[PDB]
Amino acid sequence: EVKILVDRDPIKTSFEEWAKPGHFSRTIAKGPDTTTWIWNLHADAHDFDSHTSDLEEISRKVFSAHFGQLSIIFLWLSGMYFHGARFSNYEAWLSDPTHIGPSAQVVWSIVGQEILNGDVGGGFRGIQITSGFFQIWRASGITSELQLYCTAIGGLVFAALMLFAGWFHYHKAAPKLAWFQDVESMLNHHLAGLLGLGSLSWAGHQVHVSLPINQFLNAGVDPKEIPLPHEFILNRDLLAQLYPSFAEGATPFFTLNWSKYAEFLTFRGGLDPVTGGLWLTDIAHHHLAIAILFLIAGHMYRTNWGIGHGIKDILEAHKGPFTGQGHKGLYEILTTSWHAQLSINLAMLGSLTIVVAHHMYSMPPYPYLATDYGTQLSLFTHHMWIGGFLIVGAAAHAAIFMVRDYDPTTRYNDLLDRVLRHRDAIISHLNWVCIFLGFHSFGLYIHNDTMSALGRPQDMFSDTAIQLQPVFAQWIQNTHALAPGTTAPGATTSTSLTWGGGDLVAVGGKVALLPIPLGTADFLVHHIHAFTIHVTVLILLKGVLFARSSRLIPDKANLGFRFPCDGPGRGGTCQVSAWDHVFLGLFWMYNAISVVIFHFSWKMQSDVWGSISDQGVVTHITGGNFAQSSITINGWLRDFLWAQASQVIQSYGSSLSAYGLFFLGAHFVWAFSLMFLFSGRGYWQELIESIVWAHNKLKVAPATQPRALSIVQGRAVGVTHYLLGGIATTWAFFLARIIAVG
């Protein structure tokens, strides 16, 4: 049954292996004859599946790598906390948050870079930060620096503990294979233990520490006069004065009359007027409910006892109209190969990150976060980029599994075979829908441009000539506006202010949130989003499905997952491996994410953000020209790229010069990438031949003969440089513009 199984000292810690490189693979271990050897030593460093074949060693290596990664993350967190404690102006920002810019980095005075120490405010000079850490610390209840120092020390200690644990589990006591394959216990502990207890404990902290300190802060008291958090725990009088319910203690909870706790566990919803964030009582209530739900749901699978459920029984016994026998051999597939689990987890994490970004810009969960425009922009863009990258990687790992871990003899699955047997219909229909969507979505813009250039503004697809309104979205907005009165009797207001109707919420003369209207431009942009998403899905799905074999190459599995081509014959067979399909899909993911972030930035700068006056009128940043100027490509090039780049390029001689320097550097790297993307290997090898002759003429030729990069390495270098250049350009442009004008 379920038990702990370990092996004692599988490997011995010794420096002998460090002396010689490439010990994992024999062909690497032989010795270097050409430079290519070096480039291989890094390519197969983490290819644990190809070093050996036993599952036990792979699992142990995976565990140790996870521990190392956790240690690195803890070290990074400790460094951030120590920087916040030592070189920062947190205490100044605490008293006057609206007129002080956060900053936690100070530049030395070595060469002339001291001009980077801009005057953020509050008697401090330093680089303004846009990580949103200050809002997190304020919402946590931290009001000093000693607490931050203690947190940093604890983080360092935790990093050391994680490193020791990784070493101990790889070199002293290594879990056996049967320990890993016990997924029922893993799921039970991950649901009930990690997600339930953690959120319950955080709810306890929020109820006991964050709520009273934040109440005192919002009441207008000076930060240096607020009582320390432990005084609230020790003294019941202070809590009773702040909340009378605590005077009754824990008696009501055991008596099931929970309404007595309605003082600090509410259901109002909406945004708090003082700070423009969600009510902390609602957040604590939500955390408590989530804890209860997760603790309940973590006791579903049978482990070592009579009660519970079996995953294999659930999968096998499920009979449906469309599936049939269906899920039969999926349990072995998902418990035998690591790559399938990696693919599913990567897809789920990417989707979760994107949803996180959307929900976080929609409803600000931290105090004084909505009015900080740079923080919002940075958080949204960063999280969406991360989600896109993870979603892309999922397909690559699925292709790896399909290539090297799929055999129909020992493990057979009906649904997978049924999907494989009719791939042509899937690909054909996906291709047709992609063509149709792209044709319509881009033809609308081209038609708008052409009718504009000919002096025919009455034949456009616009808000005045021919209208295409998103009626369904408007209906949903109206239903959500009307919901709190009838559909949600408990909720006092709307879940978020984004839905049409309601009132503007502004903090300190700056607009925090107001309803976002939808028109023709939103229709067109959403259809463009759908088109790009569909094309990326088509590329990745084709790469995954046609990995094992194709009509052109009937034996593509033998060649492997990473092979440049098959030869000049058959008319040319370049880029048929699934790796090349991933390399092609990266560009389209980049395109889609760039378009989406551009849309979000322009819409927010045009129709939401701005300034409010004493009289009551609202003046937006760009004057609300998105509704009429974004229906043509000329409008996107002139009113958005040309107009908003003034702050980036005219930042020389000021405290934002680094942004312009990075703006130029990203352009240089993007132009550099085309050198690898466009050319071929033979020319470079033939040039290196003459260079090597010139070297040998002077008796300075090396023993490791130079060799041009392989084809796959060239493509990888090209795509890496391209992505880095584009992302850095967008980063510099966004940050400079939103810091200057926001």
Partner: peptide
């Protein structure tokens, strides 16, 4: 806040 900035310029 002044001391934090001065920590960089001690030398």
């Amino acid at each position: 806040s002044g001391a934090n900035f001065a920590r960089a310029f001690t030398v």
